[PDB]
């Protein structure tokens with residue numbers, strides 16, 4: 001898979017399990033079209049969102065549903081979600097890992113981009 | 117002003133100056149309506165976006181235009197922008213500071229909510 | 232004062248108040264000598280650690296006592312402390328702000344170096 | 347291995363390769379004794395630092411030599427190194443991953459602790 005999402009919990013020091021993730025792609029008419037979705041595993045990872053064929057050039061938005069995650073743990077967090085918006089594959093196909101580290105009032109995100 | 121934005125540059129170890137910031141409020145039909153905007157100052161801060169009277173409870177989106185900032189520095193960035201989406205709550209503290217720490221392929225954001 | 236420390240709590244969305252901070256300077260024999268210390272204020276800031284006259288070029292270590300902070304909040308933390316080790320440089324800008332963002336199993340730290 | 351170190355470069359969006367890492371353990375007399383060392387691989391990971399037998403309870407310091415890393419890339423960075431100081435195995439053996447995300451004037455670090 002050319003797109004993987006990895007989520008960690010900075011309060012517990014653990015993978016963030018069962019986090020819902022929705023991916024969108026900006027359309028020809030400039031709206032956000034649903035592209036893929038899934039939930040993180042026991043390792044905090046979400047594989048198999050898309051294929052090399054389907055993951056064409058475009059502007060993508062990865063929405064990580066952090067509020068639902070925290071609420072299930074009894075925490076009222078600040079953010080509705082974490083959003084990662086980026087152009088993909090504009091210089092040829094790449095492999096993208098979107099990592100996120102979650103706290104109730106803060107998140108970070110970093111991309112690891114590799115070339116096959 | 118109940119909403120402040122502060123942006124830092126993790127590559128240069130400096131405030132992120134002249135970064136455009138756009139704030140939106142979610143409308144009843146689920147679209148994002150422009151609410152306020154500005155550019156960060158020499159201290160990386162953006163004050164005066166809104167007022168207590170206007171900043172009512174609701175869902176807000178703060179977009180920090182990071183791609184243009186890195187391009188101006190000659191550095192190839194990953195993200196289109198950094199996005200902070202949150203519900204404003206009256207039972208919460210009175211002042212929201214949205215802070216962001218920027219790198220070309222990473223950002224963090226935190227909320228500091230105080231009286 | 233050429234050295235300021237600012238600490239934020241990523242769990243509560245607040246300044247980290249009453250956090251002990253110890254600063255050391257590396258001695259000729261490679262040991263760490265106490266240099267300055269204090270506790271963060273209600274704004275999460277620690278001002279007045281040193282003076283321009285005393286803060287000469289050298290290697291400094293700032294230890295932020297995060298474990299005691301989390302224990303006081305009833306939260307089990309990972310680290311003993313957060314540690315920031317750097318060389319102070321006169322050709323650099325005049326004022327160093329060491330900022331830290333704290334979670335129980337994670338921290339970040341950045342330097343904001345300005346005139 | 348019960349101790350793994352993973353390092354990412356936030357400027358390039360890549361693993362941080364060939365980063366030197368030194369681990370110390372606080373001694374009976376309260377000094378920092380050398381415990382293990384190594385360098386990160388092409389994946390930004392450092393495996394095989396220690397064994398379950400050797401990794402006893404104690405206070406450990408993981409020093410990631412970030413200044414040397416940045417200087418090799420033509421950057422004069424702020425920090426001498428990133429230091430991660432923690433008590434390990436005080437409630438029985440755990441597996442520890444120490445992750446670090448590096449920028450020239452900033453780093454973050456998070457621990458992922460799991461139970462076997």
Ligand SMILES: O=c1c(O)c(-c2ccc(O)c(O)c2)oc2cc(O)cc(O)c12
Pocket residue numbers: 122124213215216217224225226228237239328330331332339340341343
């Ligand atoms: O509000 C601030 C803030 O959130 C951070 C911060 C954010 C994320 C990080 O990862 C980090 O290391 C620092 O720094 C600051 C530095 C200042 O001088 C003033 C600030 O107001 C903040």
